[PDB]
Amino acid sequence: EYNAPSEIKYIDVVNTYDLEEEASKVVPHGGFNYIAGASGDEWTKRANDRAWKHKLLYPRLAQDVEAPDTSTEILGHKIKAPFIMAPIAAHGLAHTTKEAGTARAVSEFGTIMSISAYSGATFEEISEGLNGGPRWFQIYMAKDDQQNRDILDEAKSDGATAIILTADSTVSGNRDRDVKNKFVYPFGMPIVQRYLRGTAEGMSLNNIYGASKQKISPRDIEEIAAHSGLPVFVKGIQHPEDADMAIKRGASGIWVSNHGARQLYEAPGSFDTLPAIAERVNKRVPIVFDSGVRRGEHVAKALASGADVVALGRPVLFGLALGGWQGAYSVLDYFQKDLTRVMQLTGSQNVEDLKGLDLFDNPYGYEY
Amino acid sequence: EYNAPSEIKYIDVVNTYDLEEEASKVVPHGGFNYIAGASGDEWTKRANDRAWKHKLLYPRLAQDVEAPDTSTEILGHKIKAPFIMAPIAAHGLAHTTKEAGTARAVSEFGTIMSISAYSGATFEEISEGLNGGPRWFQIYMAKDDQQNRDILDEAKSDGATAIILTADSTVSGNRDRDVKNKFVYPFGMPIVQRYLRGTAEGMSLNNIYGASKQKISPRDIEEIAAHSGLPVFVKGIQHPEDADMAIKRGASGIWVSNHGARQLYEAPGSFDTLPAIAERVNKRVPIVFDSGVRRGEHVAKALASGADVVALGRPVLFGLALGGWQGAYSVLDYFQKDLTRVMQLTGSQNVEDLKGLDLFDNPYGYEY
Ligand SMILES: Cc1cc2nc3c(=O)[nH]c(=O)nc-3n(C[C@H](O)[C@H](O)[C@H](O)COP(=O)(O)O)c2cc1C
Ligand SMILES: Cc1cc2nc3c(=O)[nH]c(=O)nc-3n(C[C@H](O)[C@H](O)[C@H](O)COP(=O)(O)O)c2cc1C
Incomplete structure (x- = not known):
């Protein structure tokens, strides 16, 4: 009923945009369009991408920099680069090794795995892939309080540290590809079953x-913070309030996220919302940024604009x-x-230096 | 030949502006004008004060706040309120108990004492007032590297924790009051001995x-960093670069400081420089703000604009x-x-809440 790819191999990544067309050749049509698609005619997914052209990097010269260090720390975790894995449901739509495959990539690379409440893999199956690596659990809340207590307790017992x-998916976005394809999951979700x-x-x-x-x-x-005694991120924020x-x-x-433009349509590109949120947060708590990161330049621009790390998805x-x-x-290696x-071309020896970059304001936007 | 006041008493502080006119009827003209005065015709000291009218506080209603907590932490010092004592030379111009009197006030209140290299009191006199309270040492760098080594060593032996x-005083400001008064210190600087x-x-x-x-x-x-093995603040910054x-x-x-407008003339009011600096720092290190703090509203506006604490001076x-x-x-009690x-009127339960305040931009400035 669903024949996901099963091959395991390193790939030569020239850029991440070319991966979408390449993946479209191996992933079944319904699953592929579930992963790739976004709300409406995808104008806000295009906005996520074009927003990176609103703020442009300066090359900086004679900065006395060599062999930049991508490492950083978030919530007591030293990680190889200032990016983590975003929580994404149903990895078995992409590959038979599903969330265990993603977890093994993330732990092998040296960053944090976010586990979706809508995983097709059990905590035991993901834990085998992680082999001790750090993990954060993403809750899609039950209506029943006790079921939330049980989900949280399972996640923390599995080793979650956040x-x-x-909160941006109380109802589905208008995902026209999935409506047209009549997309349904071809396997169960053991954590929320x-x-x-x-x-x-x-x-x-x-x-x-x-x-x-x-x-x-x-x-x-x-109530999540009180029950878990773990740091709680609120994901989906686009408005500083x-x-x-x-x-x-x-x-x-x-x-800071718009869920990869999968939720509210005719909303801003995620990166355009980051500065106002960072200015209102004003250092009180760490910021994770996602929705549209495709290049190292995007990681740099997010950090320069107030994000501590970015999350990677599609x-x-x-x-x-x-x-x-x-x-x-x-x-993950391509991004690092x-x-x-x-970093070398911007005069940045380390991740803190990236946080100090000034960006060029491009009022013409994408067409220039 | 200098007759400073010696009376010790509590004062009913209605506002800090009235303290300037109040005191001299032993309280010597030259020393008073040394403390009160600033560069040129004092236009930049007036700019320090009028800058607070550029960004105005909103009252916030039904915010579920009572008994705000003013306490905060900086470089692992827990302090009673988000203000410290600025480093000021020659407290004996103000009072016979000089820096020991200031230190006792600061220590009893529960914040950090900044010791000027140009103190009229020895470290042991100040230490007696501090009674184990936290202290930071302010250095005026030496041409002679040995003198830098020696003062960094005395400050750390003295118990300095920063x-x-x-750096904004490599030459004196054009302090017209002191020139007209032919002002000279009436006592020595034992620390720079x-x-x-x-x-x-x-x-x-x-x-x-x-x-x-x-x-x-x-x-x-x-070199200060490597020698001291203590955190180094760079004081006098007004430009983000x-x-x-x-x-x-x-x-x-x-x-962030312009030294109370005592250095470069025809420069901005210090508060106007703070947001550009906070944006460039982008959380990398803590920010202290000073130059013109006179009211609680000024402490709140500094925090809302990116300072971790402010320093109090005149x-x-x-x-x-x-x-x-x-x-x-x-x-100090007035300011708290x-x-x-x-905090109560802005909906702020704690110092972190103040960092999240939005301010009203007043483009008309002081005359409105
Ligand atoms: C296929 C897919 C499934 C997702 N499932 C979840 C989910 O289970 N939980 C969640 O919090 N966000 C989910 N998201 C949103 C991601 O966490 C993330 O915000 C998004 O992938 C970022 O956009 P980008 O991948 O285009 O850069 C999903 C996104 C994709 C592409
Ligand atoms: C009388 C006087 C002496 C000062 N001496 C020093 C000094 O020795 N070291 C220093 O770093 N700053 C010195 N300053 C600057 C203060 O640290 C501080 O930046 C200034 O007092 C803040 O402005 P305000 O008091 O008007 O708010 C002095 C300022 C005053 C008023």
Whole structure:
């Protein structure tokens, strides 16, 4: 019923954009379009990408820099580069090794794995791929309090060192590709099966999101932090007022995101929202930035604009489709090498230096 | 031949502006004008004060706040309120108990004492007032590297937990009041007993600046860092490029200041420079802000604009000023209570909340 790729191999990554077309040749049509697609006619996914041309990097010369160091620290974790893996559901749509393959790439590379509540793999299967590597658990909340306590407890017992509350998906975005393809999951989701009564296999994302909590309030941020005793990120923030609210409600981190343009349509590109959120956060908690990171220049620009790290999504999954853990690893390696070049050319010896960069304002936008 | 006030008493502080006119009727004209005055016709001291009207606080309603907490932490010092004592020379111009009196106020209140290299008191006199309280030592770098080694060694033996490298005073400001008054220090500087080769009574103000290092470079920042093994603040920064330079040269903090308008004339009001510096620093190191803090609203606006703490200067000294005598522990207590009010009216439960305030841009400036 679903024949995902199974080959494991390193891949030569020239750029991450070319991975999308390459993955379209190996991933079944429905699954591929679930991964690649976005809301409406995808204008906000294009905005995520074109937003990077709004703020341009300066080359800097005679900066006394050599062999830049990409390493950084977040919430007590030293990581190889200032990027983590975003929480993404159902990795088995990309590759038979599913979340275990992604986890092995992430742990082998040296950064943090975010586990989706809508994983097709069990915590045991992901833990085998991680081999001790650090992990954060992304909760899609149950409506039932006890089921949230049980999910959180399972995640922390598996070794989670933060909780990501994704709050921007109380209902599905208008994902026209998935509507046209009548996309349903071809396998179950063991972590949230408890609140689907029946199995996620043959269900639409509309109906799984429909089972999760719609009426998320700030109390939920408080109650997740109190129960887990772990730092809580609030993910999906695009408006500075939600950042201030989340922090005052007990969040330990702000995760700036529009879900890869999969949720609200005719909204800004994610990168354009980052400065106003960073200025309102004003150093109170760490910021993770995502939605549209494709190049080392994007990592640099996010850091220069207030993000502590970025999260990587689609490009890593396309890498998993093309090579299993080694393909996914190839993408993480591409980003680290890509960033190293950009650090050398911007005069940046280390990740802190990137946070100090001035960017050129491009008022003409993409067409210039 | 200098008759400073000696009376010890609490003062009912309605506002800090009135402390300037209050004090002199022993309180000597030359010393008072040394403390109160600034460069040129004082237009930049007036700019320090009027800059607070450029960004205005909003009252915030139904914010679920009571009994705000003013406490904060800087470089692992827990302090009672987000303000420290600025390094100021020659407290004996204000009061016979000189720097020991200031130190006792600061220690009893519960914040950090900054010791000027140009103290009229020995470290042991100041230490007696501090009674184990935290202290940072402010250095005026030496041409003679041995003198830098020796003063860094005394400060650390003295229990300093940071060094303040003041870099904005390589030559004196054009302080017209002191020129017209023919002002000379009426007592010595025991801490800089090593440098002045001749006499510490017979070196007016230009010659003491003269014996110091004019040719401070980034290497000076690196060398203070390596020698002290203490965090180094670079004090006097008004331009964002100097903040980036200082951090890359090993500074552990940025101290945004124009020295109370006592140095470069026809420069911006210090508060106007703070956001560009905070944006460039982008959380890399803590920021201290000073030059013109007179009210709780000023502390709040500095925090909302990127400072971790502010430093207090002239109002605390008003140990001496014009009419009847006022400035000390009462002034620190005034600032704490004034900040508490502003926190309640802005919806701020704690110091972190102040860092998230949005300010109203007043393009009309002071006359409105
Ligand atoms: C196929 C796919 C599935 C996703 N599933 C989840 C999810 O389960 N939980 C979540 O918090 N976000 C989910 N997201 C959003 C990602 O965490 C992330 O914000 C997004 O991938 C970033 O955009 P980009 O990959 O285009 O750079 C998903 C995104 C993709 C592409
Ligand atoms: C009387 C006086 C003496 C000062 N002496 C020093 C000094 O020895 N070292 C130093 O770094 N700054 C010195 N300063 C600058 C202060 O540290 C501080 O930046 C200034 O007082 C802040 O301005 P405000 O007091 O008007 O708010 C002095 C300022 C005053 C008023």
